[PDB]
């Protein structure tokens, strides 16, 4: 146990990933070498801790976004998210089940008596609401 | 008259018990009848998968 990282390594890992995402990769030794010149880290023992957290975070980044961000990642998600627009809309149903009261509302609005609207049998009982208190 | 001494296999370790952590609750299944599986408590270092003797079948079952 006792391998929980510290703010000192986490802040630095986030910052260097944000700054040098293009230069860096998902190889530990490559990351521990690029860090040696992209940051003046006084200690080797902290440098390779930073490199390990960097590899962990970048392995995460390849799959999904995290709290640390990158502008290219934002643009990639924007250009990818506008997808699976169906060939047929989910809101063009051939029939629409409609209530008698809402049908009265439509005829008030003058847009009633549409062919697409199909009135349904109103519910009977008025058995909504839940029983009060426990039991 | 005595029920014969039998053997069982630990399938899972539930967790420590005894208010000193001196025993563990584990789940055991019988090789003599794999469907029959009860909750036993044992003392000593227990890993999952190990088999162990049982002098008597039904003593107590309690949830933590």
């Amino acid at each position: 146990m006792g391998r929980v990282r510290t703010k000192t390594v986490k802040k630095a890992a986030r910052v260097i990933i944000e700054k040098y995402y293009t230069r860096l990769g998902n190889d530990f030794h490559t990351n521990k070498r690029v860090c040696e010149e992209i940051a003046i880290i006084p200690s080797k023992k902290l440098r390779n801790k930073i490199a390990g957290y960097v590899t962990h975070l970048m392995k995460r980044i390849q799959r999904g976004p995290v709290r640390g961000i990158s502008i290219k990642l934002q643009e990639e998600e924007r250009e990818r998210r506008d997808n699976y627009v169906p060939e047929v809309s989910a809101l063009d149903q051939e029939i629409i089940e409609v209530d008698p009261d809402t049908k009265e509302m439509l005829k008030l609005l003058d847009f009633g008596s549409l062919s697409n609207l199909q009135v349904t049998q109103p519910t009977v009982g008025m058995n909504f609401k839940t029983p009060r208190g426990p039991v | 008259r005595v029920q014969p001494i039998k053997l069982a296999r630990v399938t899972k370790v539930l967790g420590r018990t005894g208010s000193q952590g001196q025993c563990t609750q584990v789940r055991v299944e019988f090789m003599d009848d794999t469907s029959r599986s009860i909750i036993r408590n044992v003392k000593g270092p227990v890993r999952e998968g190990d088999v162990l003797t049982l002098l008597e079948s039904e003593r107590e079952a309690r949830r933590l």
Partner: protein
Amino acid sequence: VRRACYGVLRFIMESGAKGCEVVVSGKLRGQRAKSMKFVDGLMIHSGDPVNYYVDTAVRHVLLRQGVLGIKVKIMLPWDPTGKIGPKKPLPDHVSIVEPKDEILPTTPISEQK
């Protein structure tokens, strides 16, 4: 002591330090002794870096009522040239150079020289 200590604090910070800390402990006009502490800025205490980051001094002041102890700790500012500050940077201090942002990934070209 409040005037003198605050003047010393101001002089230290004006001459430029990450922080400083003075303690005056002893008896003034009363039997019961009191210690008064005045701090400002950063001040590290533990580990190796304190040895070459913090300048310490302890003096005795002989008053008619007895003895007054003065303790002074000054966290020196980091100095690359090292004449007025420590040479090494703080071990936990990590600083990252910003990229040039001169990417320019345009159409391929060849430049002869």
